Structures are given as C-alpha cells and as structure tokens.
C-alpha cells in the first residue's frame, strides 16, 4: 500500500492473468489483449525468494541441554530451570511474531513498489503520446495496432513516429 | 479511435490471511507456514546413533542390572528412556541422581575398563536374590560387594593411580543394612565407613542401619556415589565396612550426546531433528511440537502457526 | 520523509486544519477555502490504530517465578539467578527500543506515503487542465468556482468540460 | 484569472519528540507512552485471591506458630509477606528454607489433614514457654514434640502409607538440645537419631548438642525438614530420640500461586497486575516499576519512557 | 530499489562524481558538465550518520557475572550455567543478524528515495519546458547556456522566461 | 539545439558486500564493521583497578599462604588469576570453593580486621613444614591452628558479637588428621567436633581421620568453611578438637568487582573492556573475541563479521 497502486488506484487484480504477477491489458482497433510483464514479475518473485532463503532451513544444532519436564517437587533449582526455559521460549516467540509481521508488511510494500515501477516505466516510454486516466490505464491518442502494443511491452516503441499524430488528437478543440 | 493500455496485477479466488505491522488479517495471494506443528510419530534411527533403552534406564545400564547386561560398553548419540523401564537388582538410591544421569548421557559412552584392586583381607563378589543372573544369585556387573572373611573385616586401604591421558569415572556405593545383626554379620564392625578421595577432593559416608520400605525382597539400601580422577591423580579408597567397590572406571568424554524421555517407537528413516513426540522435519525455522529437541531443529515457539506472505495483496475481480 | 512530501516539497503543515490530517486549500475568483480530505486522513489513522492494537493490552501472564531480591550473600546459585534475570531484562529492553524505533520510522513514512497518494490522486484527476507548481500546489488554468473546486475534492470533476479552456490558457504566447 | 489548489497536511503548536532508526529526536504531532512508570501504591484485592501475611511469614503459618493460628487451611493466589513479621514460637532454622517457601507458595494451600501415628512408647505433646497459646505453654500446631515416658525412649518405628491420589507433604523436625543433661532428660539416650524415608528416598539426621545464641528464652534449636510421599508410597519414620514429629500432611498442588515481599497496603480495587510497589495498570506493553510482578503485566524494561508516534511529522506554520 | 531509480531506470552510477552522492550531468551548446547536488547528498549522509550514532559506542557495562569455562564435570548446575549462556549468545546473535539486515535494506531504500526526490525536484522545476527521457535525463527544449543550467541546479530557474520558446519546440510538426 | 540534463548518483570501483532482508550479497559503496574480532593481546591497567594474582589464587591470598602475604588488605576492580599459580601452604580443600571465590571476588576487598578471641585452655599458633615463612615453620596468616595444652583440649566456647554496621566474613577450618595417634596427640580426644553458628544458622563438622594422597609433605587435610555475621548478630564457635580458628573477619562489600582467568600480560594503556584475550576497543556494538568480558563491552555474538551499509547500492560504469 505504500505506493498506493495495488489496492489503491488499481481497483482490483486480474484473476485471468496466470503467466505473471504484473502485466498489460489493451484495447485498440484490432481488438483486446492481455500479456504479462516478466521483468517486474521476476523482480518481485526474486525478492520474495530472497526472504525465504534467509529463513528456510537455517536451523540451530543443539545436543545436551537442560531438563524441561519434572516428576518431583524440588524448589529453588527447579524453579530456575523452568524460569530459564520459559524466558527463552517467550523471547523466541516474540522474535517469531515480529519477524513475520515485519516481513509481511515489506512483502506487501515491495509488490506495490514493483507495480508502480512498471507503471512509471510505461509512462515515460509513451512520452507526450498518452495521458494517465488515473486508474492504472493510459489513453493512447493515435492508431496503435497490435504490433504497436507489442513494441510498448517489448520496449521498442519509438514515440517520435507517432508524436505528430498524438499531439494533434491531444490538443484538438 | 486511438487505444487504451491498462497496467495491472494478478489475483486469486482463494487468498490467505497474514499478519502485518498495521493489520492482523490481510489477504495475500499466497503464503507459507513457518511453524512446524506435526511429527511423524516415530524416532528416526538416522542420521544419529539412537540407543533404545527399552526396559533399562541409563543408570541401570551403567550399574549393570542383570537384564541390562546387553548395554555394556555401548555408545550413543541419543539415549531413549522408555517409561516401561524397571529396576530388577538390589534396591538403591543415588544422591544427585540427576547429575550422574546427565554427565553420563552427555559423555555418550558406557565403555568400562576393569582394574585389579588389592582387596586382600575381605571376601569379594557378594550376591543376592534381589539380583539374579539366569536364576543364580548375582549383583551389579560393575560393582563388587565386599564382606567379611573368616569373621574379620580389616581396615582396607587401596590405591589406583590414573596414569592415562583421559579422565576416569568411578562408580561406588555404600550398603545400609536393615538390622544391626546384618551389619555385624556382613562387616563385623558395629558401624562401617567409606572414604573415597583424590588429591583434590574427598567423600566420606557413614552407613545408616535401619529398615526401608520393602522393595523386591530387600529392606536395606545401597547408596550410589561417583568420583572423577584426573590424569596424574590417584584414587584412594578406605573402608572399615559396608563398601560397595568399583571394578574399574568408565571413560568420560564430551560430545554431542544426550538422553531423552519418550515412548515414540524407533523407525527406519532419516531425520535430523528429534522430539519426544518423534522426529520432525527441519525445513521450517520454528516449531511448536515440543520444547525438548535434539539435533538440527526449528526453534520452539508458543504459536500454532505463523504465515509468511509469499505474494502481493489479493484483490479479486 | 521517504516520499519527500511532508517536511519536503511541502514547506509546513496547516495548524488551522482541525477536521483532518490531509486536505485542500484553494484560491479562485469566488475566494479562498480549506477542506479536509477524509479518505486519506482515515487511511493514515486506521494504519496507526492498527499498530496500537497490536501493542496495547496484549500482555503476558506470569505467576510463580524466581526470587529477584536477596538478603544474604550466597554465591554460585544466587549469581546465576541474578544473571538470568539481568539477561532477560536487557533483552526485553532491547526489544522495546528497537520496536519503538522501527514503528516510529514507519509511522513517519506511511504518513508521508498517504500525503503523496492524495497529491497523486489529484494530479491524475486534473489531467491536462493544471500544472504542478512544485510546492504541493496546482495552478488551474480555467475558471473554477467553488462548485468546481468541490467536484475536485468530491471526485466528480469532469476534466473534459474545461479542457478546451485550459489548453488555450496553458499554451498561449 | 484561473485558480490555485494546494495539497497539504495538518500541524500542531505542541508536538512531541520521538526516536526513530535515523534520529533520536524528531517532532511528531502526537505520541503515546509505552512504559508504565507509576503505581497506585496499594495492592488490589481483586481479581486475585490475596493473603495478607500481616505478622506471619508463610513458614510460620505452615508450622503453626501460635499467633499464626488464623492462617490454618487457607488458600491463596498471592501471599504477601510483610517486613514487620516475626517468629514467636520455639527457635528454629530450615535447611533449604528457600525451597520449602517456594514449593508451598507455588502450591497455594495450607490445607492440612491430621493422621493417627502410633507413638506408643513415648510421651507426646511437649510444650515450651517460648511458644505460648493464651499464656499457656504450647508448641507448633502442626508438630508433635515426643519425649521420654517413665525415663525410657524406645526405638520408634511408625509407618503411614499414601493410599490417596494426591501427593502428601510432611513437615518434621529435629531437636538440638543445648546441654547433655537436656538430651538425656528429654530423650534418655546420649545422642538421638531421626530417619524419615520412602521407597525412593531417605533423610537421616543426627542431632547436635550445644548451645546457640539465645533467642526468646531458648538456646537450643529445632531443624525443619520436609518429605513428599507419592501415591502408592509409604512414609517410614524412625527415631531413637529428638524427633519432632508431624501430625499429618499438607496437600501439595500445582497452580498459579506464588508469594511476594511488599509493605504496600491492601485496597478494595480491581487490577490484574501486582508489583511490590502496588498494582499497576496493564494497558501498556512495558513497565519499569518493578522487576518483580504477578499476573497479567507489562514486561519490565530499563527505560523510563518510550514514546510511540501516533501522528505524522510536525511542521508548524 | 523501492523507488526504482538506483539500479533501476538509472543504468549506472558516476565513478567520476567525487564531491557528492547525487548530482547533475548536462550537455548544451556551450559544452558538457558535472556538478554535485548538496541538499540531497547531505540528506542521505545525515540519515546514515543517524543510524551509526544509534549503534556506535552505546555499550553495556557488566561486572561480576557467571563462570563460562569449567575444568571439572559437575552435572546439573553446570548444565544450567552453560545453557543460560548459550541461550543468551544465540539471542543476541539473532538480534545482531536481524539488525544489520533491516538497517541495510533501509539504507538502500533511503538512498533510492533521496535519488527520486532530486529527480522529482528537478521535474517540477522545469514545468512544461522539458520532457523525461526515461533514463534519468530530461530533454530541455530551449537554449540553455551554463548560466541557465546553473539556475536549475541552484533553484533560481524562471520557467516563464523560456516557456514560449520551449512550447514552440515541443509542439512543432 | 536545446540541452539535456541528466540526474544521477555516484559509484566506486571497490564496493563492499552486505546482507539485506532479501539478499545476502549486495554491493554498496561503503560499509563499516560491527563485530570487534581482534584484541590488543594485553590487559590495560586503566581505567579499572587490576590486581595481577601472579603466583597466587584469590583463595590463597584470602587464607594467607606465605608467598601470598603481599596481597593482604588489597582491593581490586578485577582480579586476574594466572594459570601458573600454585599453593605452597598446608594442603586444603574447600566445600563450595566456587561460591567462596565468587563472593570474595564480587566483594572486591581483602581487608581484614583482627579480633581477640578468648582461646584460654588450648595452645595457639600451630605451624608446619608444608607452610614456611622465610624457612621457618608457619601457617596461614589469617588462620589460627589450636592444639592441646599440657595434654588437654577443653570444650572451647567463644563468642564474637558483630556490633558494627557492616557484615563480617569469617573463614575457618577443620583439620582431618592422617592417623589416630596424630588426632590424640594434637587434640587429645579420639575424634573432634566444630560448630560455628549464629542466631540464624549453624555449621557442624566432624573430622575424618585417615590419610589422603600425599601433597607437599602432608597426608592430612584442612577443610575450609565460611560464615557471614550480620549486624546485631553473634559468632559462636565451639570445639572439642580439630578447629582451625579465624583470627578475625573480612569486610564483605557489594560493588563492580569480579575475577577473571587469563594469561594475558598487563600493559600501560587505557581500555574500558577486558577479555581473557586482553582488552578490546568498545567502539563497535558487537564482538566475538570472548564470551567472558568485564566492563563496558560490545555484546558477544557468534558471527565473525557483520557489515553495516554506509552508502547506496554500487553500480559501476
Ligand atoms: C550372610 C547371611 O546369610 N545373612 C543372613 C542372616 O544370618 C545371620 C548369621 O550370619 C549370624 O551369624 O547369625 C544369625 C542368627 O543365627 C543369622 O542367621 O540372617 C538374616 C535374618 O535371618 C538374613 O536376612 C534374610 O536374608 C534373606 C536373603 O538374603 C541374602 C539375599 O539374598 O539378599 C543372601 C545374600 O548372600 C546376602 N549377601 C551376602 C553378601 O552375604 C544378603 C544380605 O545379607 C542382605 O540382603 C543384606 O541385608 O542376604 C531374605 O532377604 C530375608 O528376607 C532376610 O530376612 C541374612 O541374609
Ligand atoms: C524437662 C525439664 O524440666 N527439663 C529441665 C531440666 O531438668 C532436669 C531434670 O529433668 C533432671 O532429671 O535433673 C536435672 C537436675 O535436677 C534438671 O533439673 O533442667 C534444665 C536446667 O535447669 C531446664 O532448662 C531450663 O528450662 C527453662 C524452661 O524450660 C522448658 C521451656 O519452657 O522451654 C520446659 C518445657 O516443658 C521443656 N520441654 C519438654 C518437652 O519437657 C523445655 C525443654 O526441656 C528445653 O526447652 C529444651 O532445651 O524446657 C528455661 O528455658 C531455662 O532457661 C533453662 O535453663 C530444663 O527445662
Ligand atoms: C606434634 C608432633 O610432633 N607430632 C608428630 C607425632 O609425634 C607423636 C607424639 O606426639 C606422641 O606422643 O608419641 C608418638 C610416639 O612417640 C609420636 O612421636 O609423630 C608423627 C609420626 O612420627 C609425626 O608425623 C610426622 O610429621 C612430620 C612433620 O610434622 C609436623 C609438620 O611439619 O607438619 C610438625 C608440626 O609442628 C605439627 N603441627 C603441630 C600443630 O604440632 C604437624 C602435625 O602434627 C601434622 O602435620 C598433622 O598430621 O606435623 C612429617 O610430616 C612426617 O611425614 C610425619 O610422619 C607428627 O608430626
Ligand atoms: C506459495 O509460495 C510457496 C513458497 O514460495 C511456493 O512453494 C514453493 O514451490 C517451489 C516450486 O514449485 C518448491 O520447489 C520444490 O522444492 C523441492 C524440495 O522441497 C524440490 O525438490 C523441487 O525440485 C523439483 O523442481 C526443480 C526445478 O528446478 C528440479 O530441479 C527438481 O529436479 C525437481 O523436479 C522443487 O523445486 C518449493 O519447495 C516450495 N516452497 C515451499 C516453502 O513450499 C508455492 O508454489 C506457492 N503456492 C502456490 C499455490 O503458488
Ligand atoms: C494521541 O494518540 C492517542 C493514541 O492514538 C489518542 O488516544 C486515544 O484516544 C481514544 C479516543 O479518544 C481513546 O479511546 C477511549 O478509550 C477508553 C478506554 O481507555 C474508552 O472507554 C472510551 O470510550 C468512549 O468513547 C467511545 C467512542 O466509540 C464510546 O463507545 C464509549 O462508550 C466512551 O464514550 C474511548 O473510546 C483511547 O483510549 C486513547 N488511547 C490512548 C493509548 O491513550 C489521543 O487522542 C491522541 N492525542 C491527541 C491530543 O489527539
Ligand atoms: C565508510 O563509512 C564510514 C562510516 O560512516 C566512514 O568512516 C568515518 O569517517 C569519519 C570521518 O572521516 C571518522 O571520523 C573521525 O573519528 C575520529 C574518532 O574515531 C575523530 O577523532 C576524527 O576527528 C577528526 O576530524 C574532526 C572533523 O570535525 C575534527 O574535529 C578532529 O579534531 C579530527 O581532526 C574524525 O572525525 C569516523 O571515525 C569514521 N567512522 C567509522 C565507523 O569508521 C568512512 O569515511 C567511509 N569510508 C570511505 C572510504 O569513504
Ligand atoms: C519397622 O516397621 C516396618 C513397617 O511395618 C517393618 O517392615 C514391615 O515388615 C513386615 C515383616 O517383618 C512386612 O511384611 C512382609 O511383607 C511381604 C510382602 O509384602 C510378605 O511376603 C512377607 O511374608 C511379610 O509378611 C511389612 O510389609 C513391612 N512393611 C514395610 C512398609 O516394608 C520393619 O520390619 C520394622 N522394623 C523393626 C525393626 O521393627
Ligand atoms: C557458651 O557461651 C555462650 C556465650 O557466652 C553462653 O551463652 C550465654 O549464657 C549466659 C547465661 O548462661 C547468658 O546470659 C543470660 O542473658 C539473658 C538475656 O540476655 C538474661 O536474662 C539471663 O538472666 C542471663 O544473664 C548470655 O547472654 C549467653 N550468651 C549468648 C550469646 O547467648 C553459653 O551458655 C555457653 N555454654 C557453656 C556450656 O558454657
Ligand atoms: C594407605 O595407602 C596409601 C597409599 O599407599 C599410603 O600412602 C603412601 O605412604 C607411603 C609411605 O608410608 C608413601 O611413600 C612416600 O613417598 C614420598 C614421596 O613420594 C617419599 O619421599 C617418602 O620417603 C615415602 O617413600 C606413598 O607414596 C603413599 N602413597 C600415596 C598415594 O600417598 C598410606 O600411608 C596408607 N595408610 C595406611 C594407614 O596404611
Ligand atoms: C508433543 O508431546 C507433548 C508432551 O506430551 C504434548 O504436550 C502436552 O500436552 C498435554 C495434553 O495434550 C498438555 O496437558 C501438556 O501441558 C503438554 N506438555 C507440556 C510439557 O506442555 C504435545 O501436545 C505433543 N504435540 C504433538 C504435536 O504431538
Ligand atoms: C518500586 O520499588 C522498587 C523496590 O524498592 C524501587 O527500586 C529501588 O529503588 C531504590 C531507591 O529508590 C534503589 O536504590 C534500588 O536499587 C531499587 N531496587 C532495585 C531492586 O533495583 C523502585 O524505585 C520503585 N518504583 C516505583 C515507581 O515506586
Ligand atoms: C580468545 O580466547 C578464547 C579462549 O581461549 C579463544 O577461543 C578458543 O579457541 C580454541 C582454539 O583456538 C577453541 O578450541 C575453543 O573452543 C575456544 N574457546 C571457547 C570457550 O569457545 C578465542 O579464539 C580467542 N580469540 C581471539 C580473537 O584471540
Ligand atoms: C515482442 O517480443 C515477443 C517475444 O519474443 C515477440 O514474439 C514479438 O514479436 C515482439 N514484438 C515486438 C513488436 O517487438
Ligand atoms: C461534495 O460533497 C459534499 C458533502 O456531501 C456536498 O455538501 C457538496 O455539495 C459536494 N459538492 C460537489 C461539487 O459534489
Ligand atoms: C549557483 O551557485 C554557485 C555557488 O555559489 C555560484 O557560483 C553560481 O554563480 C550560481 N549560479 C546561478 C545561475 O545562480
Ligand atoms: C612466581 O613463581 C616463579 C616460580 O615459582 C618464580 O620464578 C617467580 O619469581 C615468582 N614470582 C613471584 C612474584 O612470586
């Protein structure tokens, strides 16, 4: 939520996009399409896998320790043995709760970050040929067939080629 | 006619709830569990060396209770004590039973070298019907019951120097007779005494005559004590009666060895982490199966479950 | 500070806004006004309340523990009892210091985030009828009475209705 | 003429200083305190069961010091020991006083069932002027001072089986006479002996004749010991002299019970958290009132104060 | 990485800038230049120094504690003394690992934040006289000698003075 | 022709690797080390008061071993025990040696006030060839070996009231003769007894006759015990033989004092933090030099190194 895109100015996700986490949905004269963006999807997945690798199978080897169950009443020494262990468990329980809370807040923020990065990447690409509609969609002011859409996704779109046409439509009266 | 290009993100119909700094229930596309909360129910016999105590406690294997004769000189990474275990030799108690159990468990070996002590003056190899080997009256394998010889028990004075590189662990005892006649019959003197000492320490025990709740034929008791002799040091044993003598020493190491109480059966499998509930996988960083673990284990926590978000916030269509 | 709005390109706050945390201040031909934005104010407050609920009254029940004051010198066992407790207090003291430090840094960043979100919400709404003056203020290039201001705040502003008028003023020579 | 629209945020004239990762003093609009640093000064008698020891320690209530007779069979969630408490019976000491205090405090009950021990052979119910009940020479309510009968003290041998489902806690003692004449007068033998035992354990005490610093009329002492008998087990007491015998057992539970040292008065109020300084509110997660707490409490920390930002950075006009 | 500037839409850093962390590189008719921006450089450095001051020389005074090496086998009490200490070391080791991980992630994000802030500061300054080329560079559509570049860096650039000239070049056909 | 203005950031050819939440190796422009992993090799004699034990343990300085006479009445912030230390007086052992060492180390002073005990009835100032002062037979400076006078050892009964504001620490002993003739020659009775007591406590020791491994001429031993007398309390010593008597008390404080085992030499330098490896700087928050520290120290961690990023991510040209 820290960038306001996911669960913000984007009203909902696309349950139909199943080859990526972030993508494009276009409508032009040739029809309507949906294609996933890989660089931003891979960027979010790699970061989340990084977290997991720092947590999964990094465990502690312990061997002989202290007794933690008791069949007799003993008093002073047993109290301290129980206290030591109860103190340790509470502290690791706290570490566990905070760890998950922190990581989850960051996972939500970094996925929001990666959405915004893709939005910003596209916005600079389209230069003065398009206008942000405010809901994660750009209005493209020129003829843009599927090969033209593909060049935007692929990052090969020459804005100069359509500038005159878009400027005319953008600033018509 | 132009065109419209929309930037977006994916979503799922079956999201998962996770906690954050600001929210204790928020839906993400996917999550993974960080608290191991299930066990296989059995203790894997690999990769650690598991010693199933079966009917025997560690102490009874140490002392040489007859039905525990099979455990002689065994080593272990983890000794598993079953609740069905029983003692079937001469009734005994151990001052600081817990410390003796822990040091042997920690040492991880029952290796025992015999040693020739000069017990000239007393009879050896005393036996009892509370401790039978194949129906025959016997005693603790590692202990030597000394009693009178021709109605005389002289002042014993025997030495055993540790000239080895390792420490020696000596286990010895004191008989507490039920009756004064039992005292004089066995040891001649009206009351005994035992002093085991080294250059650095000493332990002196006066026996206590008097009956104890009947246990398995006997109303007397044997108290068990231990002594560690360092290299260059000397074991010195004195007795004017009631000495339960050692037949040698145990090697005493330091290692990764320990002991666990559990009635989980042993299985043919491979698992690094052992709990009294059985082995658990160690792929997760946390677990709430048991606060008692052995090996490479997730750390115990109070929580049932802790869900780590592995995906963005979920916003369905 | 992470978005640079609060205590950044906004020079100071408004001590006079007492019905919200974020808002609007306008000047047109009908006069000058101030109105608080609720959705962004509620968004920041709900997040901060979320933090508080995770901290307030979640305490630990403890009963019989160990002794922590002593009237005699005793040595080995007393040393360990004091050490255990002194170790526990230092660790929870550390947890407390880091918790507050982390939470406060995030509280400042999320309030900065919510300011930026409102700025961005408005900027996309005004389309090509306005220009960012750089200090958190937009210059609106057309006649915009109070009903026109209200439609911006309320989110009902049709930019098409004023586009021709604003484009003429924006690109005059 | 156009229009200008400015986006902004609020501010206050009276901001608060907080710490962050990058800054130990930054001004925000508002903050809340996370360290409870004040107490009400009184211990709330609710919702926990508070037992005000007043003039009595827990041990003296256990033993049955006459001015502590009111505490008989009481239970408690928290026993409060006042510094003004005093002992006013026969002078005594307790080996491992601390462990006996903790186990009884933890058990949370003074429930005492009487039991009929066969003390045939000795006189019972010995008394002293150091322990008076309404001006009359008396003794600890829960202890039985056995002494000679017609100048004879036979070898006592009495059994008490625990056939109940619960554990039994037995408190017993040993008299250490000031003089040899006091020894022979009370117990006939030149030196006594006491052995309390079960199937699993034993405790044997030899009395020590000799005076001790004068305390409240007496220069002898009574040493206090305890024994826990499990179900199916048997209490076995032996004495050839100086036995201070128990009149029964205490129930010994496990619960949420404990004991606290404090001179804070008891009040009529409701508070979950108790410190020796008095009750404190538990709305905050941390507190630096006292490292000694009982109940649902904030966790002790060294810090006076920890301010949590509840508002944005403050930038006044 | 959370703003996508450093190691994002900026392809690499400038090894040649040695008087600052963030700066400007321009090309006009008079030549090509490089000058460091101080306010953003000082902003990042002050934040990082703030972290260091919270960590450097804040240590704990401890005097008599417990023994932590042993020459004899002792059992129950020695086990608890070893356990207490081994537990403490593991917990502080964990605190140390998480501290550095958290701080480093934030240090990378705040330096990325400060880069973006400078980019945004410049973008609003240039108004409609320039266009974002998408790689951290602005194309300036008018004559801008070195005194004109200096006014941008210094924050004295009057966009009105060049607006007519830039608007003509921007919207030529 | 226009112009182009590029925004950017710096970079370096020699970046450093750091860990993050998402990455365990990422390059930044600069970093700083947070784990102190080196020592100077010597213990700085400032700003703390260092007492180099040299050839003497703390206990031997306390008791007054002749080659330790120089340590009398010294104070210390940190007592440094060398491995080359040796005992060169009468052979002894100490029940709870560790507790006596810790309480004296913690107290931080060897201050000793002499006191006039009434030992009328026995000879004083016994000596031995195992404990020589300038070739002359002597004894522990702070202990008084009492033995018979004209073949008689009466029942000693001596009192010493603590009428001071501070606590008194009394160190005393018991001789365990090698032979029965040695017992009767020194103390006349067939077996001795020692009882040191206060209003609150008591310690009674029965000597044990019998030889012990030969140490430096002797096969008997002296057992060392201690007693703390509070203000208003009274020290009461009784003996029918074998008492090694104190010549006074030690002051017993509470402070910042302790004791460390190390063979690191002492140097002329200033360093707040002391480890057995020598002083270390305390500029960093963590250290992995030693888990044993004294003073204002970085906290011990298992990690070699922990690099804190002090610069942005590094992306070279
Ligand atoms: C050595 C022996 O046989 N002692 C028995 C004792 O004999 C006395 C005799 O030695 C003395 O000179 O004269 C008197 C009167 O004439 C006695 O006859 O008598 C006791 C009471 O009758 C016996 O106690 C009984 O022991 C039974 C079984 O005993 C064994 C055992 O199996 O535990 C036999 C063992 O060989 C013996 N151990 C050794 C090293 O000799 C042990 C040992 O003496 C006791 O266990 C120690 O207390 O006893 C039953 O247990 C029966 O319940 C019990 O009354 C003496 O055994
Ligand atoms: C049983 C008794 O009365 N003992 C007193 C003892 O009597 C001796 C007599 O039994 C013996 O046969 O012959 C000699 C010489 O003829 C004695 O007379 O004498 C002691 C010294 O005179 C007394 O000590 C004094 O006791 C005082 C008060 O004593 C009580 C008490 O109140 O504590 C009386 C109690 O009834 C008694 N307890 C029992 C179970 O009988 C206790 C108990 O004996 C002692 O407390 C244990 O040490 O004593 C004063 O305390 C006075 O200071 C003290 O000298 C014997 O009481
Ligand atoms: C007091 C004394 O001289 N005792 C020695 C003892 O003498 C006996 C005599 O007292 C008795 O009346 O009659 C018999 C037979 O006629 C003896 O002669 O004899 C022992 C064995 O011969 C000696 O043991 C030897 O002691 C040697 C050195 O002893 C000293 C020492 O330097 O440690 C001398 C000290 O003055 C003495 N201490 C005091 C306070 O008098 C100590 C002390 O007695 C012992 O150290 C305690 O055990 O002894 C050698 O150590 C030799 O190895 C050893 O056999 C008695 O010393
Ligand atoms: C929710 O998120 C979780 C966590 O990110 C995610 O689970 C992960 O999925 C991966 C890939 O499917 C799992 O990887 C497997 O791990 C096992 C060992 O545990 C490997 O042996 C497997 O190897 C196979 O595939 C490899 C591909 O290179 C081959 O090299 C190999 O020979 C095998 O063919 C496999 O890689 C991973 O275990 C889980 N992680 C966890 C913690 O569960 C899950 O996909 C997400 N859920 C949904 C519904 O999307
Ligand atoms: C600085 O920030 C703090 C923390 O965010 C903030 O303090 C909070 O204010 C709220 C609302 O005023 C307090 O809520 C009250 O809590 C008590 C119990 O402690 C309730 O009983 C109260 O209930 C009343 O109001 C309810 C409204 O729905 C009714 O349902 C009810 O019947 C009562 O009429 C009330 O909700 C809250 O306790 C504090 N929190 C803390 C930690 O102090 C404070 O407002 C900010 N300071 C400034 C100057 O703005
Ligand atoms: C990598 O980052 C580290 C950490 O940020 C950075 O190291 C720091 O550099 C500063 C400045 O060079 C060091 O400051 C010095 O500290 C000592 C005490 O340790 C002071 O005595 C020094 O004082 C001199 O300079 C002062 C300037 O005002 C004068 O007042 C004074 O009289 C002296 O002339 C000096 O300030 C600091 O110690 C380090 N910190 C650490 C943790 O090392 C380093 O520069 C970066 N590395 C690279 C290659 O850029
Ligand atoms: C002191 O008192 C105890 C308790 O009464 C005495 O022990 C008791 O001794 C009798 C026999 O002397 C025991 O009976 C026996 O029981 C077994 C099996 O239960 C039975 O097979 C035998 O034939 C015999 O009947 C009794 O159970 C036993 N009690 C306990 C608790 O052990 C002890 O002997 C007394 N000592 C003296 C010196 O009087
Ligand atoms: C061994 O020495 C101790 C210490 O001197 C002896 O105890 C002392 O005994 C006398 C009387 O015998 C006590 O005096 C009494 O004091 C009370 C109140 O203080 C007074 O009311 C009496 O009338 C009497 O005067 C003295 O205080 C006491 N000292 C202590 C410390 O208790 C002990 O009796 C001696 N034992 C032998 C066998 O000699
Ligand atoms: C009980 O047994 C022990 C062990 O044998 C006896 O101690 C031993 O006593 C002899 C002499 O009586 C010692 O020899 C001496 O050695 C020293 C230096 O090593 C030498 O200088 C002397 O001249 C003498 O030869 C022997 O070493 C010693 N052993 C130990 C381990 O101390 C003890 O005396 C016996 N007691 C009885 C009552 O028999
Ligand atoms: C693993 O075994 C432990 C020990 O038996 C189980 O914990 C006990 O559960 C009982 C009732 O189920 C509780 O009354 C006890 O308080 C628990 N013991 C302790 C020491 O807390 C535990 O439930 C088992 N877990 C699994 C997953 O099998
Ligand atoms: C609560 O009571 C405790 C215990 O008495 C107070 O702490 C002691 O304060 C004295 C002087 O005020 C210090 O010298 C002691 O070191 C403190 N005791 C301990 C164990 O550290 C504490 O100040 C009281 N707090 C409140 C809020 O009443
Ligand atoms: C500081 O001294 C300690 C203690 O001697 C060193 O740690 C020991 O190192 C040996 C071998 O070098 C290991 O076998 C031991 O396990 C270590 N001791 C403990 C208690 O773990 C340590 O290496 C020294 N460090 C420095 C920097 O000098
Ligand atoms: C974009 O890349 C895809 C994947 O290789 C390719 O099939 C497509 O033709 C490309 N389109 C353009 C316009 O470059
Ligand atoms: C905006 O909403 C407010 C609140 O209901 C209303 O009073 C006002 O008339 C609305 N204005 C416009 C322009 O929608
Ligand atoms: C910008 O500031 C620098 C530093 O003082 C100065 O040398 C330069 O002349 C200034 N340029 C402009 C255009 O203000
Ligand atoms: C310490 O002992 C050694 C060998 O006994 C000796 O050379 C050295 O001088 C002694 N130093 C002191 C201060 O006693």
Numbering used by the authors:
A (entry chain B), C (entry chain B), E (entry chain B): 1 to 173
B (entry chain A), D (entry chain A), F (entry chain A): 9 to 325
Sentences from the paper on this structure:
IAV strains are named according to the antigenic similarity or serotype of two major viral surface glycoproteins, hemagglutinin (HA or H) and neuraminidase (NA or N), which also play key roles in binding and release, respectively, from receptors on airway epithelial cells. Influenza HAs bind sialic acid (N-Acetylneuraminic acid, NeuAc) containing glycans (sialoglycans) on cell surface glycoproteins and glycolipids as their primary biological receptors. Previously, we and others have demonstrated that over time, IAV HAs within the human H3 subtype have evolved more complex receptor specificity, selecting for elongated α2–6 sialoglycans featuring at least three linear LacNAc (galactose linked β1–4 to N-acetylglucosamine, Galβ1–4GlcNAc) repeats beneath the terminal species-defining sialoside moiety. By utilizing a variety of structural techniques, we provide evidence that this enhanced mode of receptor-binding has evolved over many years to include mutations outside the traditionally defined sialic acid receptor-binding site (RBS).
Co-complex structures of H3s from the 1990s onwards reveal an interesting pattern of redistribution of H-bonds around the terminal sialic acid moiety. Importantly, this alteration in the positioning of LacNAc sugar residues (a change equivalent to approximately a 30 – 40° shift the positioning of the GAL sugar ring relative to SIA, see C2-C3 bond) appears to have become permanent, with bound ligand conformations observable in essentially matched positions through the following approximately 20 years. While our observations surrounding the amino acid at residue 159 are consistent and predictive of H3 receptor binding preferences by glycan length, it is clear from structural data that evolution through the late 1980s to 1990s is complex and encompasses residues within the canonical secondary structure features that make up the RBS. The alteration in receptor binding conformation shown in Figures 5C – G is principally contributed by HA variation in the 130- and 220-loops making new H-bonds with galactose and sialic acid. Residues 190 and 193 no longer make H-bonds around the O9 of sialic acid and the second GlcNAc, adapting instead to make new interactions along the sugar chain and giving rise to a slight structural shift in the overall positioning of the 190-helix. Firstly, between 1968 and 2000, enhanced binding to longer receptors evolved by spreading binding interactions along the length of the receptor sugar chain, rather than concentrating mainly on the terminal sialic acid moiety or terminal sugar linkage.
